[PDB]
Short mmCIF file of N, CA and C and ligand atoms in Angstrom, two decimals:
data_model
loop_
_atom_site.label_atom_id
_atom_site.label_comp_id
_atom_site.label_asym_id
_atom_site.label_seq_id
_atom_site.Cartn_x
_atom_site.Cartn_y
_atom_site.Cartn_z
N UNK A 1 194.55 197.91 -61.26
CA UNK A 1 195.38 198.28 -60.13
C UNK A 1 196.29 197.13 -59.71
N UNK A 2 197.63 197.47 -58.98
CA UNK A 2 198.63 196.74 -59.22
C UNK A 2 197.87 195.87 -57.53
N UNK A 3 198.79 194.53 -57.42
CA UNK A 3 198.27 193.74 -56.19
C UNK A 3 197.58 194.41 -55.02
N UNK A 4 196.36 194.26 -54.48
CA UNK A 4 195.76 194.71 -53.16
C UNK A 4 195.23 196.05 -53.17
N UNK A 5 195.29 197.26 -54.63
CA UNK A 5 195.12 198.29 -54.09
C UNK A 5 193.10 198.25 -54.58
N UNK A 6 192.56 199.31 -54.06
CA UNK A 6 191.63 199.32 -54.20
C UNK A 6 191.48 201.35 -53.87
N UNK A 7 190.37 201.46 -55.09
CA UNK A 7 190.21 202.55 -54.94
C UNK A 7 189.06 203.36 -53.66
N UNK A 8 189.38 204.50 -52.85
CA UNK A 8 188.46 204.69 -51.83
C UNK A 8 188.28 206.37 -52.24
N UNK A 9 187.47 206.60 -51.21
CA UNK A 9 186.63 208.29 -51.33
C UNK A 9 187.09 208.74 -49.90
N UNK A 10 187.78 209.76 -49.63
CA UNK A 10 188.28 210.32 -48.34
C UNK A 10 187.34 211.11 -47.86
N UNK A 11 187.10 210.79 -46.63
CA UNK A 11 185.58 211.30 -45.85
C UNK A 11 185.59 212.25 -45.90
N UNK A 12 187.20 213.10 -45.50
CA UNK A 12 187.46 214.46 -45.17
C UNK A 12 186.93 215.55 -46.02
N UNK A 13 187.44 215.10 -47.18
CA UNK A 13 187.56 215.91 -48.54
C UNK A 13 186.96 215.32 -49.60
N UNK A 14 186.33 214.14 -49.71
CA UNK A 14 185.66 213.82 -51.10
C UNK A 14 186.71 213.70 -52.25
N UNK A 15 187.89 213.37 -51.94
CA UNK A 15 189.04 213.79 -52.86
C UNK A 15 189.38 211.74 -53.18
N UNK A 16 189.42 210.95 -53.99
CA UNK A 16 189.57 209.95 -54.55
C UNK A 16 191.10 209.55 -53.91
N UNK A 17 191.17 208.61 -52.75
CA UNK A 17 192.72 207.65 -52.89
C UNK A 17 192.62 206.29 -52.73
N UNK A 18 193.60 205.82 -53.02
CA UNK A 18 194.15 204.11 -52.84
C UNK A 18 194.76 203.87 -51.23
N UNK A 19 194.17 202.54 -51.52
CA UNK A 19 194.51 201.65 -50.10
C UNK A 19 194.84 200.27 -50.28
N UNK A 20 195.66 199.82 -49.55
CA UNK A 20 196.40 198.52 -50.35
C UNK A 20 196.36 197.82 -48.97
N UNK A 21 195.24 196.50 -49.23
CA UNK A 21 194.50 195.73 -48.52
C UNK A 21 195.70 194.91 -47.58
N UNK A 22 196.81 194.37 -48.12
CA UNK A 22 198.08 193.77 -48.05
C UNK A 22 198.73 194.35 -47.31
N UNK A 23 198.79 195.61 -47.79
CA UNK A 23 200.26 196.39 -46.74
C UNK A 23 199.67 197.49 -45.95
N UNK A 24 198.37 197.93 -45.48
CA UNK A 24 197.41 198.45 -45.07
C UNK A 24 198.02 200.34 -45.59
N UNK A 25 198.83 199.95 -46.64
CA UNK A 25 199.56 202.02 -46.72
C UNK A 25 198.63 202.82 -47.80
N UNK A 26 198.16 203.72 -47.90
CA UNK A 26 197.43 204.92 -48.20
C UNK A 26 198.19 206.11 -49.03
N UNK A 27 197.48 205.96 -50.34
CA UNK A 27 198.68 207.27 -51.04
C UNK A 27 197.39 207.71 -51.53
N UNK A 28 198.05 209.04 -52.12
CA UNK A 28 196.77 209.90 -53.24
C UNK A 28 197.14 209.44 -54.48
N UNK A 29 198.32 209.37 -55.18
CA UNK A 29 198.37 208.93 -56.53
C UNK A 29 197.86 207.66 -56.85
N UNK A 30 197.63 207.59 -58.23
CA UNK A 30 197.02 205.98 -58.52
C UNK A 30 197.94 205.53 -58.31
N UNK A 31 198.46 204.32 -57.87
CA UNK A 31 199.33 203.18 -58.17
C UNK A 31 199.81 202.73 -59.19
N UNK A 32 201.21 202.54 -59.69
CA UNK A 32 201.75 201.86 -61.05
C UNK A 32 201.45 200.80 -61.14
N UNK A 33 206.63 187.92 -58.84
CA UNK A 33 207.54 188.45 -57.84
C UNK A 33 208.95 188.46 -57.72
N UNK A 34 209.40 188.81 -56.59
CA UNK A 34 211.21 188.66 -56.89
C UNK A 34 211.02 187.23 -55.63
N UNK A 35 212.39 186.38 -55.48
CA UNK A 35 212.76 185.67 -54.73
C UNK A 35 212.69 186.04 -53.20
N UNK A 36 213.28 187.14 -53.36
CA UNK A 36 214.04 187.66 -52.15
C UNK A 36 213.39 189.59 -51.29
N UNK A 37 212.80 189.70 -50.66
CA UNK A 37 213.27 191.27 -50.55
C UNK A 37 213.92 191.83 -49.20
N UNK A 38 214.56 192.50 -49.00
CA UNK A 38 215.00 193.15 -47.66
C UNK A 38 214.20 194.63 -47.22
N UNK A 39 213.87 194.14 -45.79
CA UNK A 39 213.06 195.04 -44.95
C UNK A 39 213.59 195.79 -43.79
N UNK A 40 213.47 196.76 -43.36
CA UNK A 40 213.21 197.08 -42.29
C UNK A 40 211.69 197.60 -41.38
N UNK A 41 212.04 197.48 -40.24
CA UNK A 41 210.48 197.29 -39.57
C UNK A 41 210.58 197.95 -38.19
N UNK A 42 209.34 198.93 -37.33
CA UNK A 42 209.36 199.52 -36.50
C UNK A 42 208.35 198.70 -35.49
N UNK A 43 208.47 198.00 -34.48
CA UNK A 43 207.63 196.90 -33.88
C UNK A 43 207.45 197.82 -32.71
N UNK A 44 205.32 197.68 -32.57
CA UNK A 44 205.21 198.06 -31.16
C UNK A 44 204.67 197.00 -30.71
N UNK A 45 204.90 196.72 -29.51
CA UNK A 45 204.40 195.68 -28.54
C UNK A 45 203.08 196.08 -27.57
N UNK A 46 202.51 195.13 -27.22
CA UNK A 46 201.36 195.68 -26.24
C UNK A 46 201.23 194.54 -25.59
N UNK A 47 200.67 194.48 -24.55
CA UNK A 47 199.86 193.88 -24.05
C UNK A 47 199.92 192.08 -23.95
N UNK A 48 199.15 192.55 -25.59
CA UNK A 48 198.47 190.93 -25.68
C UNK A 48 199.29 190.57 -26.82
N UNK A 49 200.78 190.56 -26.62
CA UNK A 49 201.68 190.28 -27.68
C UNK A 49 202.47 189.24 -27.04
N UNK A 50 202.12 188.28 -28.16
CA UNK A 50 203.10 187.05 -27.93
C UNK A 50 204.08 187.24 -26.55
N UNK A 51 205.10 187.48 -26.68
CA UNK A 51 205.81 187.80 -25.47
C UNK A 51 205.90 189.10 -25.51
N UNK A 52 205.27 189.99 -24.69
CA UNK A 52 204.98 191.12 -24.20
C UNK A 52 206.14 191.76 -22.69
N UNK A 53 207.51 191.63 -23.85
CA UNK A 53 208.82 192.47 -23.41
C UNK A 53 209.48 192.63 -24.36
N UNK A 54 210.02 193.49 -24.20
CA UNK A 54 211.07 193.62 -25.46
C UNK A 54 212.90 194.31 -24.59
N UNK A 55 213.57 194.39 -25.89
CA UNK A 55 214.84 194.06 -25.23
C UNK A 55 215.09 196.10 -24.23
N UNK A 56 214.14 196.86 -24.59
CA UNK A 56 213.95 197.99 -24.27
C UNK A 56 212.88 198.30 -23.18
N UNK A 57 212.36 197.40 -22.86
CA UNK A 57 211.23 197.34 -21.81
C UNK A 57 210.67 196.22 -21.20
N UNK A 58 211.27 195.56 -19.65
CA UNK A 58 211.37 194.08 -19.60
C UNK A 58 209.62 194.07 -19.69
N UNK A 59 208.97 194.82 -18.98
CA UNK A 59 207.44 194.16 -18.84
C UNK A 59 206.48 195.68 -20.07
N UNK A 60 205.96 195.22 -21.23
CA UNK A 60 205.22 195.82 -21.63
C UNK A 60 203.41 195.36 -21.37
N UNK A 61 203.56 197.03 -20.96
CA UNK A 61 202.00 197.19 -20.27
C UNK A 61 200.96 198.07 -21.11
N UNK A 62 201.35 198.40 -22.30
CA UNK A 62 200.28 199.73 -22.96
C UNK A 62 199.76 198.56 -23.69
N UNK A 63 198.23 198.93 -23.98
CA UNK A 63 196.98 198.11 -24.59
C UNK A 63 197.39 198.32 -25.95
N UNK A 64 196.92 197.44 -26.63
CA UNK A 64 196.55 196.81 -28.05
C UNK A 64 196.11 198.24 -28.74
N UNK A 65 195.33 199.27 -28.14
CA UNK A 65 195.07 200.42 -28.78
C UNK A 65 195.77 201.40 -28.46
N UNK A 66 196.66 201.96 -27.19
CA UNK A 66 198.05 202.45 -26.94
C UNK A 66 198.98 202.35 -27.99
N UNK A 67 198.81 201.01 -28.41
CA UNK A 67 199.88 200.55 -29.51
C UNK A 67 199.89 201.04 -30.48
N UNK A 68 198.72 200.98 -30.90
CA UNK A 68 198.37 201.43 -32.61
C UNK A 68 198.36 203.35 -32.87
N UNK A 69 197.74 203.60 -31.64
CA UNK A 69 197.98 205.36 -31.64
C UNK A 69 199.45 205.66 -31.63
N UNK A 70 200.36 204.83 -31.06
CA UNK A 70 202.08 205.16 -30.90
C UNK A 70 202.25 205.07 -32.45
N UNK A 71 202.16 204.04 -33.04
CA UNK A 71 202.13 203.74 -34.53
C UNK A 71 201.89 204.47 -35.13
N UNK A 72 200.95 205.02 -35.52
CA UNK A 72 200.07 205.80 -36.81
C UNK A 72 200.75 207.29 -36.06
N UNK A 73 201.07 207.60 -34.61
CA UNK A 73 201.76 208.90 -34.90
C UNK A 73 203.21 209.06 -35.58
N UNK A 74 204.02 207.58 -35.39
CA UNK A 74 205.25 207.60 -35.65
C UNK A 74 204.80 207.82 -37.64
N UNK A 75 203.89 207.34 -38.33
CA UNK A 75 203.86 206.81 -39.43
C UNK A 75 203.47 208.46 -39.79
N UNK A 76 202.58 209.33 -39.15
CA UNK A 76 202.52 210.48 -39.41
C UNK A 76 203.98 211.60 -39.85
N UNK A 77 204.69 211.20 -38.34
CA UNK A 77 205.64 211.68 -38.41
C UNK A 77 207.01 211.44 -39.72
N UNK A 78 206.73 209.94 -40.04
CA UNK A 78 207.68 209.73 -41.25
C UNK A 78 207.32 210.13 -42.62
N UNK A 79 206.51 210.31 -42.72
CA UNK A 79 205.38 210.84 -43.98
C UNK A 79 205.50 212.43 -44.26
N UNK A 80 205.35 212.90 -42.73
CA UNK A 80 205.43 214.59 -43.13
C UNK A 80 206.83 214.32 -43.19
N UNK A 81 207.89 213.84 -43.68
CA UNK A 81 209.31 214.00 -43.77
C UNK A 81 210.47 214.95 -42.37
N UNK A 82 209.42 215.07 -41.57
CA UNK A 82 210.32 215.67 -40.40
C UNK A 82 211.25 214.63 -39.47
N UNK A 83 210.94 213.01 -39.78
CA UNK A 83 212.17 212.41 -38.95
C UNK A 83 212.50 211.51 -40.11
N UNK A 84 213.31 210.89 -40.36
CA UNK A 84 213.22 209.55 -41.19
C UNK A 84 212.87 208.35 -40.44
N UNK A 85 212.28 207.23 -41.25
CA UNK A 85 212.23 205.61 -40.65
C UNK A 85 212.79 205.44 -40.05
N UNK A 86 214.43 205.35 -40.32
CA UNK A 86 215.64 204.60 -39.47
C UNK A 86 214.90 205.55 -38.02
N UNK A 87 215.54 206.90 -37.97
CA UNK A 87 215.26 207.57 -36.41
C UNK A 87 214.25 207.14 -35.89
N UNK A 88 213.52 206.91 -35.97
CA UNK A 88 212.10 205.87 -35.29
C UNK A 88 212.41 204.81 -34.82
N UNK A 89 212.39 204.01 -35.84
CA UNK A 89 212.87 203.10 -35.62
C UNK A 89 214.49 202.45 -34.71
N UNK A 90 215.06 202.99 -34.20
CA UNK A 90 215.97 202.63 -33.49
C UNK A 90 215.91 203.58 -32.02
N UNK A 91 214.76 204.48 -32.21
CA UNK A 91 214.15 205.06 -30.49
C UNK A 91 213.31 204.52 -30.57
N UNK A 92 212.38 203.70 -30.84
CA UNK A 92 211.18 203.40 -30.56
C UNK A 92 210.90 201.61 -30.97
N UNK A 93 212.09 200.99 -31.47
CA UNK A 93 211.19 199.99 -31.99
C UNK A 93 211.34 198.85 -30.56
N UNK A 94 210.29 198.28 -30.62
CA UNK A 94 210.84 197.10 -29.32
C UNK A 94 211.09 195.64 -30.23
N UNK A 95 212.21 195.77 -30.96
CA UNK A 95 212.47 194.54 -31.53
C UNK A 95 214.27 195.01 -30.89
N UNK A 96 215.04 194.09 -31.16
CA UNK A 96 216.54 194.40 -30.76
C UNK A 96 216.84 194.75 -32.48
N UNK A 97 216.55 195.03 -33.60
CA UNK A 97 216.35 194.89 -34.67
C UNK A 97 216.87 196.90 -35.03
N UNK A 98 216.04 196.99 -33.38
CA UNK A 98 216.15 198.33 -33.38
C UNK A 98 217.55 199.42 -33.31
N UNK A 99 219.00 198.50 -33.33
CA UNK A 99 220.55 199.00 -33.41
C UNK A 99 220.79 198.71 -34.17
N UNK A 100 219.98 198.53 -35.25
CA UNK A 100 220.50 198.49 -37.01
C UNK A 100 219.08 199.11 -37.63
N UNK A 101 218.95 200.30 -37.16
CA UNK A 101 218.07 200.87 -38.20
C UNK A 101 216.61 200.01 -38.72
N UNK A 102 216.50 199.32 -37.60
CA UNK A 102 214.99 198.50 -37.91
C UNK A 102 215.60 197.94 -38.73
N UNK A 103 216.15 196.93 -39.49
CA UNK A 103 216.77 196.50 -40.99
C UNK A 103 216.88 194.71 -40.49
N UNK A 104 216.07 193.89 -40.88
CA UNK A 104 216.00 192.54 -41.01
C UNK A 104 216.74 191.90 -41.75
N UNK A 105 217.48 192.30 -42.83
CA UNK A 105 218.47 192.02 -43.75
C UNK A 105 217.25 191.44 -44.89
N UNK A 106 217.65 190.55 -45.87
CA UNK A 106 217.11 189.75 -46.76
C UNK A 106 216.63 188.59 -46.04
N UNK A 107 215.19 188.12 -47.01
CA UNK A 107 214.22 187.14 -46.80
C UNK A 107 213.21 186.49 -47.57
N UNK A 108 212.79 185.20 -47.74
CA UNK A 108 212.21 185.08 -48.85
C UNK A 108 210.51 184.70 -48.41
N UNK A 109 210.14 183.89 -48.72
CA UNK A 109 208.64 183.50 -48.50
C UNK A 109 208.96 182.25 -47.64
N UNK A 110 208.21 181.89 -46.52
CA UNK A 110 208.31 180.76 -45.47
C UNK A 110 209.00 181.03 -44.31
N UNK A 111 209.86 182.31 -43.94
CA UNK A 111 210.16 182.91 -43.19
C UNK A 111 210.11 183.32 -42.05
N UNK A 112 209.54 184.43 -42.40
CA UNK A 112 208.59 185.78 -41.57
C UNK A 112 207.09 185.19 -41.40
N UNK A 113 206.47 185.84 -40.04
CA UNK A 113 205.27 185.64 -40.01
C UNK A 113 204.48 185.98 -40.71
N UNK A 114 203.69 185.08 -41.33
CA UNK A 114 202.55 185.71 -42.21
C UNK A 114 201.97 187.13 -43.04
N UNK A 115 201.20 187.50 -42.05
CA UNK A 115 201.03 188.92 -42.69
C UNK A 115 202.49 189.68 -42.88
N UNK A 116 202.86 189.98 -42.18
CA UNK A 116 203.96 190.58 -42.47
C UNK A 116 204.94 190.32 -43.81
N UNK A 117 205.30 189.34 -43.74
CA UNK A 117 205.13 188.30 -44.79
C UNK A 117 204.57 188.98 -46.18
N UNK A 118 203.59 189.04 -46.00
CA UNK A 118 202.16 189.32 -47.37
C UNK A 118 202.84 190.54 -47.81
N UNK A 119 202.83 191.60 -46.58
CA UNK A 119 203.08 193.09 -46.42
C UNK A 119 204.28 193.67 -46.84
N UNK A 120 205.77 192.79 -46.84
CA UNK A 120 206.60 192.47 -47.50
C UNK A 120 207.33 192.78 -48.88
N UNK A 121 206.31 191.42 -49.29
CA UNK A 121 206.05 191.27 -50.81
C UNK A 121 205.73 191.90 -51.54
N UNK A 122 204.49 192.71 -50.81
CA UNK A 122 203.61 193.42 -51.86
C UNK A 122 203.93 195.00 -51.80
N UNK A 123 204.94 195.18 -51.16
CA UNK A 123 205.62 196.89 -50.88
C UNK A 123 206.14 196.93 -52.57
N UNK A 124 206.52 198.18 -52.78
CA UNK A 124 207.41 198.57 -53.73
C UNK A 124 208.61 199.13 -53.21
N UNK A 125 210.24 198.73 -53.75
CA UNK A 125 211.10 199.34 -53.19
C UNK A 125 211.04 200.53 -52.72
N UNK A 126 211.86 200.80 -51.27
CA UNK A 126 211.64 202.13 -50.91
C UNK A 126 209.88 202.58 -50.23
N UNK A 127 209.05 201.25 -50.27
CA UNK A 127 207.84 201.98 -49.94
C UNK A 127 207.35 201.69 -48.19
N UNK A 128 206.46 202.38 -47.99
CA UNK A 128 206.29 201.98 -46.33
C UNK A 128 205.13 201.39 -46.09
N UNK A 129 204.90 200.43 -45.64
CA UNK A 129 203.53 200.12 -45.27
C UNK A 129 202.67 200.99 -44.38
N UNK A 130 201.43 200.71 -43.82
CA UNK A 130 200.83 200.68 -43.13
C UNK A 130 200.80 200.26 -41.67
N UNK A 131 200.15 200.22 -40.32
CA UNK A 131 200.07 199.07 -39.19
C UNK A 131 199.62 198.01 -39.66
N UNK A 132 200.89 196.77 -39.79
CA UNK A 132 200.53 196.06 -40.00
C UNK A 132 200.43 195.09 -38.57
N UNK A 133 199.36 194.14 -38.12
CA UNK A 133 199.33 193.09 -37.52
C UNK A 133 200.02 191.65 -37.40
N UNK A 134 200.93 191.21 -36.31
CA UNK A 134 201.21 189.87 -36.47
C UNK A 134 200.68 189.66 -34.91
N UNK A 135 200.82 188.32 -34.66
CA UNK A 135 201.37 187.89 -32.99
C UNK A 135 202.53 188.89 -32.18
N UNK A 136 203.28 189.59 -32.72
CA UNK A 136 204.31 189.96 -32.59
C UNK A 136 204.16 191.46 -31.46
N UNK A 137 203.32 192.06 -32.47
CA UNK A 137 202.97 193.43 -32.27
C UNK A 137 202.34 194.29 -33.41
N UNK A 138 202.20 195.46 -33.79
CA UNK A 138 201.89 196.35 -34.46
C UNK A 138 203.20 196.73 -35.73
N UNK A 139 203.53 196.41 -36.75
CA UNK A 139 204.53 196.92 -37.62
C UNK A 139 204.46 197.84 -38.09
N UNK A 140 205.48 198.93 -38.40
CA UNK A 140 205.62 200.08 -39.37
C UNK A 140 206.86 199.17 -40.50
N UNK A 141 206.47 198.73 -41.81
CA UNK A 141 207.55 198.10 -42.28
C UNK A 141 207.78 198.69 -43.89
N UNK A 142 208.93 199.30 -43.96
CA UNK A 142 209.63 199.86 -45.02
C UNK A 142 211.24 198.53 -46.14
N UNK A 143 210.26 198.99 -47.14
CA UNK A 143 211.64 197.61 -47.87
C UNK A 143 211.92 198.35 -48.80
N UNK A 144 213.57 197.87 -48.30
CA UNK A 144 214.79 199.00 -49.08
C UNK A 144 215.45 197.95 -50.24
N UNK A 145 214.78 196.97 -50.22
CA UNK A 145 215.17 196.31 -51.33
C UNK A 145 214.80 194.99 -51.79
S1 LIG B 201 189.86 206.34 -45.52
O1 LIG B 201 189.58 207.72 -45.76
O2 LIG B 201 188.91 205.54 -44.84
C1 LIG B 201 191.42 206.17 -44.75
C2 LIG B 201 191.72 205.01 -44.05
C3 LIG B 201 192.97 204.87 -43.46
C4 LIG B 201 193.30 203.61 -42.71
O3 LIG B 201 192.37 202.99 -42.17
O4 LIG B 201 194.49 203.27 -42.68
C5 LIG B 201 193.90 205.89 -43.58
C6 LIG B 201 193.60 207.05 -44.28
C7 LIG B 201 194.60 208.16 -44.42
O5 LIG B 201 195.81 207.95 -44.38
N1 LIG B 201 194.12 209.39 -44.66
C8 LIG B 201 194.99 210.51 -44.97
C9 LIG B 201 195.39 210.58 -46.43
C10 LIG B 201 194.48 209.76 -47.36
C11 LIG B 201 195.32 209.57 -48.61
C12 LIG B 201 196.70 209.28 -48.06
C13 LIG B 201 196.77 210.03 -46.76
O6 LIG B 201 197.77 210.22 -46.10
C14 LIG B 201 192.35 207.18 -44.86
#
């Protein structure tokens, strides 16, 4: 298996998928560096986030687990194909990142914070991660290249 994935058993259904330790994202198919890749990213804030405002909400007050349920519904929602990333991401993200389509431009390693960072790297073009964790907030992060 290609970097981070690992094979799991779905509680629901007993039905065999992958989970990729790195970018925390979840598919049913098996799974198939560069310098540089370009991202975009959907940031929720909470609480106990580094600076806990964003340019859309001077004082953020929803908990660390507020956060992550906002997340995983937006990630629902991009998955069943009824909104795209970008639309999320530019109603919802609390980064200012959020009037360009969540889109960070290009970046290499030493950068970005850490995990995110990791989460990055280890995407496949076009793929979406998981919630990922920084200081920052909660990420939904998709790399378009
Ligand atoms: S697993 O069954 O423990 C599991 C863990 C997570 C997680 O912690 O992120 C997520 C999922 C999940 O997405 N389940 C729904 C489908 C499983 C295959 C891909 C899906 O969309 C499961």
């Amino acid at each position: 298996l290609p970097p981070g994935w690992e094979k799991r058993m779905s509680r629901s259904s007993g039905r065999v998928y992958y989970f990729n330790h790195i970018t925390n994202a979840s598919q049913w198919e098996r799974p198939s560096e560069p310098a540089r890749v370009r991202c975009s990213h959907l940031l929720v804030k909470h609480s106990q986030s580094r600076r806990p405002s964003s340019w859309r909400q001077e004082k953020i007050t929803r908990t660390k687990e507020e956060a992550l349920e906002l997340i995983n519904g937006y990630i629902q929602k991009i998955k069943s194909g009824e909104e795209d990333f970008e639309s999320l991401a530019s109603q919802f993200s609390d980064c200012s990142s959020a009037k360009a389509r969540g889109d960070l431009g290009a970046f290499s390693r030493g950068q970005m914070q850490k995990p995110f960072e990791d989460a990055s790297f280890a995407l496949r073009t076009g793929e979406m991660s998981g919630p990922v964790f920084t200081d920052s907030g909660i990420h939904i992060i998709l790399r378009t290249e």
